[PDB]
Each structure stands twice: as C-alpha cells, then as structure tokens.
C-alpha cells in the first residue's frame, strides 16, 4: 500500500473520483486535456501540496514518510488527511522511471498516472495539529476483489512515458534508448 | 405487510432465519437438466440454493426465482455483505425464502 | 515540439485511457440490471 | 402529463411525498408463497414495500412492479441517494409508487 | 437506414432535436396506475419523458420502450453525458424518440 | 460449432469481417415506430447498425437481437474495445452479425 | 440437490470438469441465424461455447441459457475469475454445463 498526505477531506475526493492532480476537475473529465509529463511531474515541488503536478499524484511507501512530507508540507492545517492507497499498474515509481535524472532521489516517490480512482483508495487516517489519528476508515467503496492481485507498473512500461525533454541525454543511453518516443533520442 | 425479514420468515413452515452478515465465498449456476439452479456457499461452511423451479412452486413464485438468482449473482460480484436469510430446511441443502441486506 | 514531447504527451494519455476503462468495467457494470428477453419478446 | 414526482403523486387519492435525500440502509428480498415483494428501510427508521402484484393493480402495472424492483436492488447495491418518495399510505409498510433522485 | 439520429429524427412529424451535451439531472420512476413511466430532467430546465404506452404505438415499439427506460436509468446512475434527443413535441413534457451518446 | 468469429462469419453469404481493435464513438438507440434499432459508429468513420427486427429474420434471432442491443450499450458505456464485427455488407448501416472483445 | 459443482458434474454423462483459475481472454457473441451463441477463450487456449437452443434441450433450460449467456457477459466485463466449469465434451467446442467462480 502507497500513502498520501492531502489536505483534501474524504467529501471532496468522493466528488471529486479521487486524488486529481492538479487541474484535473472529475477522474473521468475529458475535452480539457492537461500535460502528462512525469519528468515535469517529479521536479515539481508544490507547496500547500504534495507534488501533484504535471498529470501525475504521487504517493510515499510508507506511512511515516508520509507523514513527514505532510508536516513540512501542510504545516499549515489543523486537519489534514493521509490516504492508504492500493497498487496498481496506473502507478510509476519515479526513481526506477527517471532514474540517474530522478530530481529529489532519496524521496522514493510512486506517482499515480491521471491520478487515482476513489475506488482504489483503500482507507485514510485523520490528522490532527500535526498528529496522527492510529484510527484508519475503510473506504467503503475500494474494489478489494479487483485490486487485491494487482501491482505496479514495472519500470520498463514506463520508460517511454519518461517525459525528459527532446535532448537529456539518457534519449541516448540505458536504458532511455531502447524506448525513446518518435523524436526523442 | 411484513415489515422484517424475520416476520416474513414467520409465517411459513419449516423455515430457520440464519444471520450469515458477510459476502458470499463462492457461486455455482447450472443449466444442466434438471438441475436449473444456483449454489451459494460463505467461509462459515454453509451452503445454500435456489431450487429448480418445480411443483411446489406457484405461477407467483416464477419470477420471483429468476430475481432471487439474479440478486446472488450480483452480491457475490459487487462483494456485498448479505445480513441474514429466511431458508426452507426440509431440503439439502437448505432452499432460500428471503434475504437481507444492511447498510 | 510534435516531435518527442508530442509522443510523450500521446502515450502518456494512451496508457490512461487504457486504465479508466479497466475502472469503468468495474463501477459501471454494478448497474447493469440483466432483462428477461423471452418476456420482452 | 406531470413533470414531477409531486405533480405526478397528486393525482391520486392516499398518497405522500417522503422527501428522503439518503440512501437505503436494508433492503430485503422474498421469494416465498404469496409474499413475493422487497422491502427497504431507511436510516429514519421509515420502511417501504414493494407490492406482492395483485387484483389491486392493473395490467400495465405488472412490468413497471418489475422495473421498480431492479431500480430497487441496483440503488440499495450502489448506495445511490434517493430524493423522494410517493407512497400510497393506506399499507403497512407504505406502498411505493414513485421513486425520484437527484444530482 | 438512417444514419444518425438527427436524420432519423426527421422522417417523423412533430420531432425536433435538442442538443443537451449533458448529464441528466434528476431521475423518476412511476408504476402509478396509468402513470407507468419515466421522467428525466436536465440542469438547463428541460423535463421529458418516456411515455405510458398507449394506442399511439405500434406492436414494435413495446419492447422498445422498455429498451428506453432501462437506457435511462443506466444512464442516469453512470452520469454519462448525453447529446442528443430526438423529441416529439406535441406532449408536454416532450417525448423520447431517441437517444444519442458520444465519448 | 465454430470457434471463431471469423469461422461463424464465412457460413454465411454476403458477410465481412472488420477489425475494429478500438472502444465505441457514439451510440444512438431508437423506440420510433419502424425505426426500433441501435446505431453505433467508430472514430474510423465506420457506422452500424443493429437491424429492426424483420422478415429476414427467423425466431431463434429475435432474442438474440434483443441481447445484441444489451451488449453494445454496456460496451459503449464501459469503452471496452470492440476487436472484430462480423457484418452484413448488402445493408446500409452495414448489420451487425457478431461482434468479439478481447482482453 | 449437489452441493457442489463437481458432484452435479458428475450426475451426466460425457461431461468433464475443467479447472479454470482465470478470467475469461475473449468474448465471441452472435445473433447469425441457427448460430446465436457465445463462445468463450483462456489464456491456456481452451475455447467453450454456452450452445445454440435446439432439439437436444428442455423447456426449463431456455431461461437457463439466457441467464448463462447474462452471466458469461458480465464476468468477462468485470475481469472476474471462472474457478470451474462443467462441460459436456461431446461437442466441439465442448459446451458449458455449468460454473463455479469463488474468491
Ligand atoms: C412444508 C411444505 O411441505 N409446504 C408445501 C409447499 O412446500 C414448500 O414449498 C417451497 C416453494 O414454495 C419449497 O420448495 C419448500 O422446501 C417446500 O417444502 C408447497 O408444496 C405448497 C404448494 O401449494 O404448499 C405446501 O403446503
Ligand atoms: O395499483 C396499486 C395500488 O392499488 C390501490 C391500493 O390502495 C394501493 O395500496 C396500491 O395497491
Ligand atoms: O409512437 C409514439 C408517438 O406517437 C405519435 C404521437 O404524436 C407522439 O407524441 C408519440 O406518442
Ligand atoms: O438474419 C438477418 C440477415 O438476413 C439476410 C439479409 O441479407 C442480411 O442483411 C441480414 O438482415
């Protein structure tokens, strides 16, 4: 399971169809089309928000890493929110993709692309004056059937969805090469 | 007029109300000869059918067959928890009456 | 421009558009509501 | 003809509009003898049924019975919210005749 | 055969097309004595409705109806955005003769 | 029994096989008098549809069309990607035969 | 009545149990004349067909086909696993009697 820290109340996201990255309105919404850039994505520091820019939400491998990026990042609030969140192969780890370019390395970050579905988000923890509520509520509707045998997507699928602009280099080493988009290399 | 499950499941004979409250484990349909009918079974060890449409059976009750088989396809899919069932337990396995679902 | 990023941009909906019908399989099919075709004919 | 459920629920003689806004806590299914209906209920603790079809209603009534039992099981199932209600008061539980939701 | 809806539409008198490009608003359902029918409304104010069938309709048009109604529902539950409607207006509220959806 | 679209699409005359590969573009359904049908188009310009029912039909089609039409409006919905149609190229919309999903 | 898939299994003659452990890979659906029939693959290459309504069928198994050929659909869609199925290997592709799905 990833973790989130997000402001964003239950009501909102449940509106909402899920964690959104930034801009997008409904999880389905189509007509405005947004940027899809997961190298954009991960360079994006976002304060008021963890790095949800660029088509992509990312999430933490654990519940204290996401707890520590809540603190700093919504510092701020007095009641925050940190999803518990099931895999799936809409997920990217950001270092494993990216990975000699990966802008904040030592963050381990897995980042949702087009945001994540309400129905993959397994529960949530309540956050109070930057303490954590040990009180985690199902999310009643989290599709357990389908997403307990699913998993993130291997490094190799996103490859091509890399985002480095035209030039960076890895366009022309390993592993960037051998999946290079029709003009990138 | 029954207002309850375990009212309705009063006024027969031959009937237990059983308070299952989880999803159903697995689910069997058949089209064999026969043996048009569908099986439901939950982790407690319990299993449980819809009997084949036959004589003891009503014009009344027909269609209510084809809705009963088609709400256990759908709760087993949707994982939807099932709160108790009113079954006919002269049959093995025990036929259902009436289910129950809550919240 | 329409060169690497234009791919980059298109692939990256593809693979999106991919997964929203993998989750609309799943949410929508809950409303499916099956008919009895021998008595509507 | 009516627009709306209020409008529509008028025209006839012992009959309410339950302005519900919730979804439907308990929802059960019978397929028993002469009991063939459903029953819901809600958080307010008001319970409704759906009629065992009988002389009481007409011809055309009998597939909209039908309908207004998959539209039934499919809310209760997806925690769709209802807005109202129109029953017919004179039964116990009310008898519903219309259903409308929002939003 | 037509080809689209907007020239399927006109080979009927009393039709015309309202572009909606929308998601329907609200939803109701009645097995009301002489009222078995469905009403949808949109944000914008419009109300139309699938009608009771009567004399007006055809042998063919029964099953088609019915095809309608369960349209609407599904539509309704998934908020799927509808774009046009082929409506007779010599009702009120309107009345569906089709429906067209694009993703 | 065939095997295969394709196997089931040559025991016929006047049939073709498209590949399709992609989800619905939009879908169009109908309860006209005469015009009972379900029209669906690709973003590849390709449109077909789901005939009337008619003479040219025998009566074990009769159920099948109707389930056709089931079919295509939750594929639609879902936008699961059609894979072939096997059609009837003598008509225009060309009809829809058979249809395949993979994956 | 069996309480198992395997114990109905066994009650014909020229059936065969298949273990499945898998989701449907494709879905084949025809409404061709003297072929309105699905037809079903795995991944492990096993290719199953609910049969064509013929002579070698009872009254009460035409619901059951229908329902079977309902259910066939709405597994595939929701990607659910077929735990087993009984099949009468008399026929080619060998024709489903019966399945089993737990989780
Ligand atoms: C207890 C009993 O034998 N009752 C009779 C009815 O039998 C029950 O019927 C249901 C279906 O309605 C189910 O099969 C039960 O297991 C069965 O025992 C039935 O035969 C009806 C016929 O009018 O009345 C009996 O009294
Ligand atoms: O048509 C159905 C209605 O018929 C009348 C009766 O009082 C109502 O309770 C309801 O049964
Ligand atoms: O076939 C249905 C239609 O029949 C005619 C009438 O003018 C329309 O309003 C509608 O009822
Ligand atoms: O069974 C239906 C088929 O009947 C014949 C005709 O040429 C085809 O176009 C198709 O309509």
């Known amino acids: ?185 | ?103 | 421009g329409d060169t690497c990023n234009e791919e980059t941009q298109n692939l990256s909906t593809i693979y999106l558009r991919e997964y929203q019908s993998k989750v609309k399989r799943q949410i929508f099919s809950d409303y499916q509501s099956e008919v009895d075709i021998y008595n509507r004919i």
């Not at chain 1, 780890?93 to 904040?104: C, E, I, K, R, T």
């Not at chain 2, 309850?4 to 349909?29: G, P």
């Not at chain 2, 048009?36 to 449409?53: A, L």
Request: aromatic share 12%; glycine share 8%.
């Open chain 1, 1 to 185: 399971r990833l973790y989130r820290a997000d402001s964003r109340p239950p009501d909102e996201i449940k509106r909402s169809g899920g964690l959104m990255p930034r801009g997008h309105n409904e999880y389905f919404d189509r007509g405005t089309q947004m940027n899809i850039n997961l190298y954009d994505h991960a360079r994006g520091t976002q304060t008021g928000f963890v790095r949800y820019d660029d088509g992509y939400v990312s999430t933490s491998l654990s519940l204290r890493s996401a707890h520590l990026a809540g603190q700093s990042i919504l510092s701020g609030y007095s009641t925050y929110y940190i999803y518990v969140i099931a895999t799936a192969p809409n997920m990217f780890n950001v270092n494993d993709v990216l990975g000699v370019y990966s802008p904040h390395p030592y963050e381990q970050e897995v980042s949702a692309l087009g945001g994540i579905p309400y129905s993959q988000i397994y529960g949530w923890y309540r956050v109070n004056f930057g303490v954590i509520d040990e009180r985690l509520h199902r999310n009643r509707e989290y599709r357990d059937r389908y997403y307990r045998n699913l998993n993130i997507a291997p490094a190799e699928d996103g490859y091509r969805l890399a985002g480095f602009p035209p030039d960076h280099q890895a366009w022309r080493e390993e592993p960037w090469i051998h999946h290079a988009p029709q003009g990138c290399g």
């Open chain 2, 1 to 103: 007029a029954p207002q309850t499950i375990t009212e309705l499941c009063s006024e027969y004979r031959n009937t237990q109300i059983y308070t299952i409250n989880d999803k159903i484990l697995s689910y069997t349909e058949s089209m064999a000869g026969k043996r048009e009918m569908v099986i439901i079974t939950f982790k407690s060890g319990e299993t449980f059918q819809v009997e084949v449409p036959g004589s003891q059976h009503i014009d009344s009750q027909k269609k209510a067959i084809e809705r009963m088989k088609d709400t256990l396809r759908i709760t087993y899919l949707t994982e939807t928890k099932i709160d108790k069932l009113c079954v006919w337990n002269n049959k093995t396995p025990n036929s259902i009456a009436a289910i129950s679902m809550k919240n």
